[PDB]
Design a protein around this ligand. Structure first.
Ligand SMILES: NC(=O)c1ccc[n+]([C@@H]2O[C@H](COP(=O)([O-])OP(=O)(O)OC[C@H]3O[C@@H](n4cnc5c(N)ncnc54)[C@H](OP(=O)(O)O)[C@@H]3O)[C@@H](O)[C@H]2O)c1
Ligand SMILES: CCc1nc(N)nc(N)c1OCCCOc1ccccc1CCS(=O)(=O)N(C)C
Ligand SMILES: [Br-]
Ligand SMILES: [Br-]
Ligand SMILES: [Br-]
Ligand SMILES: [Br-]
Length: 166
């Protein structure tokens, strides 16, 4: 439960075991169960994304429905119809509940304010490569539960972590 006067900042991402979350401006796998999970967590809340993550969303679909979409960019004239564009992270974090939904740069910026991380680990052995977007590594202040590996319908194995801190 979030009191309406507070500011709960959460991060939600899917990563390969290695930490890779993005490559060539795309997520380098597809996992429908994780798409559904991402919706269940974020629906009804503000979502904050960096400009490159906005670009990675299909044009017809963005802004993602049922959520207040916020795009972080330093480009004053950036066009993101249906979203709002802000030039600093702190300006993006005024709602009672906010989910930061990527990418690599914006997770790293937001982590100091965050008290929840909802992580999907994908059992794909993509090694970290030059130019990849990477997930944060959570330090010892973060704690929580680790789910069991399961086969998705597609065959790709995954497990869910729900972590938090004070
Ligand atoms: N697997 C997952 O869960 C997941 C989720 C989301 C995204 N992704 C992937 O991650 C990749 C994108 O990540 P990324 O790290 O390259 O980019 P990003 O974090 O999505 O976006 C970076 C952009 O955000 C803006 N920005 C960054 N810091 C800022 C600040 N302090 N103030 C204002 N604006 C700021 C800048 O926009 P301007 O250049 O316009 O100024 C910057 O170029 C893609 O491959 C995407 O598909 C993966
Ligand atoms: C489902 C991926 C995902 N999962 C987790 N757990 N956290 C994230 N932040 C997260 O990213 C959501 C925002 C980026 O979405 C992208 C980006 C590039 C390529 C594909 C997708 C999937 C979009 S979607 O299928 O879910 N949809 C139509 C909006
Ligand atoms: Br990338
Ligand atoms: Br996906
Ligand atoms: Br959607
Ligand atoms: Br499937």
């Amino acid at each position: 439960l979030v009191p309406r006067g507070s500011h709960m900042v959460g991060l939600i991402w899917a990563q390969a075991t290695s930490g890779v979350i993005g490559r060539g401006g795309d997520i380098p796998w597809r996992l429908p169960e994780d798409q559904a999970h991402f919706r269940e967590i974020t629906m009804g809340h503000t979502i904050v994304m960096g400009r490159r993550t906005w670009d990675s969303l299909p044009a017809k679909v963005r802004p993602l429905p049922g959520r207040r979409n916020v795009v972080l960019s330093r480009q004053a004239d950036f066009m993101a119809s249906g979203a709002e564009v802000v030039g600093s992270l702190e300006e993006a974090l005024t709602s009672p509940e906010t989910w930061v939904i990527g990418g690599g740069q914006v997770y790293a910026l937001a982590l100091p304010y965050a008290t929840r991380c909802e992580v999907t680990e994908v059992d794909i052995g993509l090694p970290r490569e030059a130019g990849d977007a990477l997930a944060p590594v959570l330090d010892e202040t973060w704690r929580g539960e680790t789910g069991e590996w399961r086969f998705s319908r597609s065959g790709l194995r995954y497990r869910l972590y729900s972590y938090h801190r004070s």
